[PDB]
Structure 1
Amino acid sequence: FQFPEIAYPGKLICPQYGTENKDGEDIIFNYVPGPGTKLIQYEHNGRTLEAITATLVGTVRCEEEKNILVSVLPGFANNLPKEGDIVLTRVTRLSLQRANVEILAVEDKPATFSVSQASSDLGETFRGIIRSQDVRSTDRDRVKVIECFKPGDIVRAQVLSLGDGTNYYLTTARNDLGVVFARAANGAGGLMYATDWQMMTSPVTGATEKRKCAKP
Structure 2
Amino acid sequence: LALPGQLLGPISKYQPGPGTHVHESNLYSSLLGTVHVTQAELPTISVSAAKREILPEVGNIVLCRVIRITPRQAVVTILVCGDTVLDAEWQGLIRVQDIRATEKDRVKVYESFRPGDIVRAEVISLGDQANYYLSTARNELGVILATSEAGNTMYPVSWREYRDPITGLTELRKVAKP
Range of TM-score over shorter length: 0.7 to 0.9
Does the CA-based 8 Å contact 2:119-2:141 persist in structure 1? yes
- Structure 2: state its 5+ residue gaps: none
Among 115, 137, 142, the residue aligned to 2:85: 115
User: Hey, what does 1:140 align to over in structure 2?
Assistant: 104
User: Hey, what does 2:121 align to over in structure 1?
Assistant: 157
Among 18, 31, 36, the residue aligned to 1:35: 18
Taking only the aligned residue pairs, the percentage that are identical comes to: 48
SS in 1 for 2:116: coil
Relative to structure 2, which stretch is displaced further, 176-185 or 71-80?
Answer: 71-80
Whether 2:153 is the aligned partner of 1:191: answer yes
Does the CA-based 8 Å contact 1:194-1:214 persist in structure 2? no
SS in 1 for 2:44: strand
Give the TM-score normalised by the residue count of structure 2.
Answer: 0.84
CA shift at 1:65, angstroms?
A: 8.4
- Structure 1: state its 5+ residue gaps: 1-5, 18-28, 42-49, 108-112, 119-124
Whole-Å Cα distance in 2 between the matches of residues 215 and 32 of structure 1?
38
Whole-Å Cα distance in 2 between the matches of residues 65 and 157 of structure 1?
35
The 3 A distance-change label for structure 1 pair 204 and 66 is farther
Higher strand proportion = 1
Among 132, 136, 152, the residue aligned to 1:168: 132
* Within-5 A mapping of 1:40-189: 40=23, 50-64=25-39, 67-77=42-52, 79-107=54-82, 113-118=83-88, 125-185=89-149, 188-189=150-151
Whole-Å Cα distance in 1 between the matches of residues 175 and 38 of structure 2?
40
Q: Indicate the RMSD between aligned Cα atoms, in angstroms.
A: 2.4
The 3 A distance-change label for structure 1 pair 71 and 198 is same
Whole-Å Cα distance in 1 between the matches of residues 53 and 40 of structure 2?
19
Give the TM-score normalised by the residue count of structure 1.
Answer: 0.71
The 3 A distance-change label for structure 1 pair 51 and 193 is same
